Scaffold this active site. Structure first.
Site, PDB file in Angstrom:
ATOM      1  N   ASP B  71       0.139  -8.214  -1.227  1.00 22.64           N
ATOM      2  CA  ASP B  71      -0.964  -7.469  -0.663  1.00 22.64           C
ATOM      3  C   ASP B  71      -2.161  -8.309  -0.331  1.00 22.64           C
ATOM      4  O   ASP B  71      -2.851  -8.057   0.651  1.00 22.64           O
ATOM      5  CB  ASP B  71      -1.418  -6.383  -1.637  1.00 22.64           C
ATOM      6  CG  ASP B  71      -0.406  -5.278  -1.949  1.00 22.64           C
ATOM      7  OD1 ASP B  71       0.126  -4.738  -0.973  1.00 22.64           O
ATOM      8  OD2 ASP B  71      -0.181  -4.954  -3.134  1.00 22.64           O
ATOM      9  N   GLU B 198      -8.091   4.625  -1.560  1.00 22.17           N
ATOM     10  CA  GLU B 198      -7.787   4.695  -0.125  1.00 22.17           C
ATOM     11  C   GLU B 198      -8.108   5.961   0.668  1.00 22.17           C
ATOM     12  O   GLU B 198      -7.266   6.681   1.238  1.00 22.17           O
ATOM     13  CB  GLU B 198      -6.330   4.371   0.075  1.00 22.17           C
ATOM     14  CG  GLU B 198      -6.026   2.952  -0.333  1.00 22.17           C
ATOM     15  CD  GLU B 198      -4.605   2.625  -0.811  1.00 22.17           C
ATOM     16  OE1 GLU B 198      -3.764   3.522  -0.789  1.00 22.17           O
ATOM     17  OE2 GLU B 198      -4.366   1.477  -1.214  1.00 22.17           O
ATOM     18  N   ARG B 291       8.835   6.516   0.313  1.00 21.02           N
ATOM     19  CA  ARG B 291       8.114   6.709   1.545  1.00 21.02           C
ATOM     20  C   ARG B 291       9.168   6.760   2.646  1.00 21.02           C
ATOM     21  O   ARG B 291       9.447   5.726   3.279  1.00 21.02           O
ATOM     22  CB  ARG B 291       7.175   5.541   1.726  1.00 21.02           C
ATOM     23  CG  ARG B 291       6.113   5.588   0.664  1.00 21.02           C
ATOM     24  CD  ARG B 291       5.583   4.173   0.477  1.00 21.02           C
ATOM     25  NE  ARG B 291       4.481   4.087  -0.485  1.00 21.02           N
ATOM     26  CZ  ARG B 291       3.831   2.934  -0.763  1.00 21.02           C
ATOM     27  NH1 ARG B 291       4.200   1.774  -0.222  1.00 21.02           N
ATOM     28  NH2 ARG B 291       2.802   2.910  -1.614  1.00 21.02           N
ATOM     29  N   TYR B 325       1.958   4.558   4.645  1.00 26.32           N
ATOM     30  CA  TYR B 325       0.585   4.994   4.661  1.00 26.32           C
ATOM     31  C   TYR B 325       0.230   5.950   5.772  1.00 26.32           C
ATOM     32  O   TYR B 325       0.828   5.840   6.841  1.00 26.32           O
ATOM     33  CB  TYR B 325      -0.260   3.776   4.767  1.00 26.32           C
ATOM     34  CG  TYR B 325      -0.499   3.051   3.469  1.00 26.32           C
ATOM     35  CD1 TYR B 325       0.399   3.072   2.447  1.00 26.32           C
ATOM     36  CD2 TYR B 325      -1.726   2.484   3.294  1.00 26.32           C
ATOM     37  CE1 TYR B 325       0.039   2.544   1.229  1.00 26.32           C
ATOM     38  CE2 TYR B 325      -2.084   1.949   2.092  1.00 26.32           C
ATOM     39  CZ  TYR B 325      -1.206   1.989   1.056  1.00 26.32           C
ATOM     40  OH  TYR B 325      -1.595   1.488  -0.165  1.00 26.32           O
TER      41      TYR B 325
END
Ligand SMILES: *[C@@H]1O[C@H](CO)[C@@H](O[C@@H]2O[C@H](CO)[C@@H](O[C@@H]3O[C@H](CO)[C@@H](O)[C@H](O[C@H]4O[C@H](CO)[C@@H](O)[C@H](O)[C@@H]4O[C@H]4O[C@H](CO)[C@@H](O)[C@H](O)[C@@H]4O[C@H]4O[C@H](CO)[C@@H](O)[C@H](O)[C@@H]4O)[C@@H]3O)[C@H](O)[C@H]2NC(C)=O)[C@H](O)[C@H]1NC(C)=O
Ligand SMILES: *[C@@H]1O[C@H](CO)[C@@H](O[C@@H]2O[C@H](CO)[C@@H](O)[C@H](O)[C@H]2NC(C)=O)[C@H](O)[C@H]1NC(C)=O
Ligand SMILES: *[C@@H]1O[C@H](CO)[C@@H](O)[C@H](O)[C@H]1NC(C)=O
Ligand SMILES: [Ca+2]
EC number: 3.2.1.18
Lengths: 221, 389
Positions: B71, B198, B291, B325
């Site tokens: 990241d 976030e 996801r 995301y």
């Protein structure tokens, strides 16, 4: 709710090809790919792969790319696995289970399992015997009487006492292969009032041969 | 515009969603000099809309692509490039340097914010009109992070949500108020929300709403409303049983508005929602655990009701495809009676789930709303991990 029924178990001799069907229900086929798993007897669980029920394309495990082939009849929501050139080491129960997510990291809702016996042995019907006692009151006011299903191939056989009604008191012991064939047995314990007065019976079905047997355990002593 | 912007309008009726942008970056990327990125988002200038993302400083084919799961590194750069093109080496515009960022136009120029650093000595520098204007340093010394969406401005004031602290514990969130890159005020998180990460923000009617992530205990998102005029805010969770974080327990029949909804802890994935009474739409991954898939579901009065189940939906990414995301954006300078509601979904490809390649990367899909009830399609990243071998 979500149900996945699989085909009936199959007997194939070494070398043949076998297509196991898994007809899926309850959910929407197109949104949840299929997992295929291998339950060997002496080994535990193996992910075989997953098929995108949307795009149709499959990811195989390493231990399986090449004789196994996943496919599906989306029209009937059925996912099918086929094994070509059956090596006897494919003796197992293959499961279809729903891939909750893309790639199958979570199999929520599994199907019933299809058993595969890769043997050259001949299908042999069983010979059923009523095992009456030489009297012998088996513990307090209980008589235990049995039924022995002997020498058949392949597994399974469906033993029931008295057409299902004698459900308590029963112990059906696991069938065992004495080299080429199977021996099975169950006991049932009933109160003395019940027998020889009511009519105890063993119903044995060996569907491979197409055999349905019904033995009265009549008092021979 | 030559003048600051005021959020005067309100949302338009969301009745279905239409494709706004699709960059096809990994698909093209198998043969062009497309950059490895992750954490994308979209933001609009008064004059054009662009895709923004955190670059990892390597092309997907380049050999330095291997290991982009990490990241934060000092080869990360916040970049922008034209709407629906790939992040190409030869056309991305580097916005500032760091591994966390937000960016947004106040009507006149735009502010970009990139945080950089060691995890215990991190520092944000608030660029305004492509020049470094202010810098804020770590208050809690354990990874200072911010939005990964665009911020909204009102009359020059653009609130921005910063969290320093533990992603596993209590962290130390704080709303900052910038006008022209300078810090007008900053205030600590307040409300019943237990942990903020976030934040996804849209502005309407001179109020800005953020829908965030509770990393710690939440499986139901914290909502922060901020008042950019008075520089005040409050937080709460979304009341609906329709749980939208990922992973999550399976949706209850009664949900939770003043505490995290108990079940999947120490984890989440950034998300958004348009919160507007009858016209509330929530976005969620389809998988309760991964996801994959993305869907938009209309859950009337979601924010306020502990019993709100959906009444209309739309599929964006199938459950057999990967997502990631998501966040809100809007074109505040789009001529209308109202604000068109848009979102983007990031489509992760690579490690850890497709570990046959050693790079992680992504493409983007974005939608805006239509009042017509249009038909739906489902929008795959599209590349075959097998042609990169
Ligand atoms: C042409 O295009 C049009 C326009 O798009 C098409 O019409 C649209 O078609 C959509 C799909 O057919 C339709 O969406 C559905 O809307 C209903 C409202 O009536 C909504 O309930 C549906 O949403 C649920 O179901 C989907 C799958 O069907 C789930 O993925 C979703 O998560 C929702 O269910 C889950 O949460 C619920 C709320 O808590 C639970 O009640 C439910 O039990 C379920 O729970 C499980 O799933 C969760 C996620 O996996 C999980 O967290 C949970 O724990 C459980 O495991 C769905 O969106 C649109 O309404 C419709 N729109 C319009 C304008 O018509 C049209 O069909 C197309 N025409 C043709 C010919 O193709
Ligand atoms: C970079 O990519 C290479 C492959 O291009 C990775 O190489 C493997 O690394 C392990 C140690 O982690 C070696 O023992 C393997 O033999 C390598 N083989 C294969 C087939 O990849 C390398 O680890 C990657 N990671 C980094 C950070 O360089
Ligand atoms: C913007 O809003 C403020 C109050 O929030 C007002 O005083 C200002 O004059 C407005 N400017 C424009 C162009 O709307
Ligand atoms: Ca969580």
């Amino acid at each position: 709710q979500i149900q996945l029924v699989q085909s009936g178990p199959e007997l194939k001799k070494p070398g043949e090809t076998v297509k196991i069907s898994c007809k899926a229900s309850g959910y929407t086929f197109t949104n949840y790919g299929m997992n295929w798993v291998k339950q060997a007897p002496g080994k535990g669980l193996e992910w075989m792969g997953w098929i995108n029920t949307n795009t149709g394309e499959p990811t195989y495990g390493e231990e399986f790319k090449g004789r196994f082939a996943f496919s599906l009849e989306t029209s009937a929501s059925t996912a099918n696995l086929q094994i070509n050139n059956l090596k006897n080491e494919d003796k197992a129960t293959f499961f279809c289970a729903r891939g909750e997510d893309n790639f199958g990291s979570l199999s929520d809702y599994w199907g019933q399992g299809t058993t595969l016996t890769v043997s050259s042995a001949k299908t042999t019907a069983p010979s059923v015997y009523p095992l009456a006692p030489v009297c012998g009151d088996t513990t307090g006011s209980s008589v235990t009487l049995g039924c022995l299903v002997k020498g058949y191939f392949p597994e399974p056989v469906t033993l029931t006492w008295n057409s299902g009604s004698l459900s308590s008191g029963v112990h059906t012991f696991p069938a065992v292969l004495q080299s080429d064939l199977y021996t099975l047995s169950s006991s049932v314990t009933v109160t003395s009032s019940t027998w020889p007065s009511q009519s105890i019976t063993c119903n044995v079905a060996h569907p491979a041969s197409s055999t349905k047997v019904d033995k009265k355990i009549e008092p021979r002593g | 515009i030559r003048e600051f912007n005021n959020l005067t309008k309100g949302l338009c009726t969301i009745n279905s969603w239409h494709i706004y942008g699709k960059d096809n970056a990994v698909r093209i990327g198998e043969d062009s000099d497309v950059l490895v990125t992750r954490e994308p988002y979209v933001s609009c200038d008064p004059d054009e809309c662009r895709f923004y993302a955190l670059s990892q400083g390597t092309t997907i084919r380049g050999k330095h692509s291997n290991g982009t799961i990490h990241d934060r590194s000092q080869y990360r750069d916040l970049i922008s490039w034209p709407l629906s093109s790939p992040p190409t080496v030869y056309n991305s515009r580097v916005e500032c340097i760091g591994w966390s960022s937000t960016s947004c136009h106040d009507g006149r120029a735009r502010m970009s914010i990139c945080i950089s650093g060691p995890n215990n000595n991190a520092s944000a520098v608030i660029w305004y009109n492509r020049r470094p204007v202010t810098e804020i340093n770590t208050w809690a010394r354990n990874i200072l992070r911010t939005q990964e969406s665009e911020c909204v401005c009102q009359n020059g004031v653009c609130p921005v949500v910063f969290t320093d602290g533990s992603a596993t514990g209590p962290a130390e969130t704080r709303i900052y108020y910038f006008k022209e890159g300078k810090i007008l005020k900053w205030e600590p998180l307040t409300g019943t929300a237990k942990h903020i990460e976030e934040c996804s923000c849209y502005g309407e009617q001179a109020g800005v709403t953020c829908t965030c992530r509770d990393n710690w205990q939440g499986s139901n998102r914290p909502v922060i409303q901020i008042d950019p005029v008075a520089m005040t805010h409050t937080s709460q969770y979304i009341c609906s049983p329709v749980l939208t974080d990922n992973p999550r327990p399976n949706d209850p029949t009664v949900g939770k508005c003043n505490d995290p909804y108990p079940g999947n802890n120490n984890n989440g994935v950034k998300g958004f929602s348009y919160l507007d009474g009858g016209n509330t739409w929530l976005g969620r991954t389809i998988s309760i655990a991964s996801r994959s898939g993305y869907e938009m579901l209309k859950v009337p009065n979601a924010l306020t009701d502990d019993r709100s189940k959906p009444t209309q939906g739309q599929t964006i990414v199938l459950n057999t495809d990967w997502s990631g995301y998501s966040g809100s954006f809007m074109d505040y300078w789009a001529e209308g009676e109202c604000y068109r509601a848009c979102f983007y979904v990031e489509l992760i490809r690579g490690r850890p789930k497709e570990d046959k390649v050693w790079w992680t990367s992504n493409s983007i899909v974005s939608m805006c709303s239509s009042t017509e009830f249009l038909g739906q399609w489902n929008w795959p990243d599209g590349a075959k991990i097998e042609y990169f071998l």
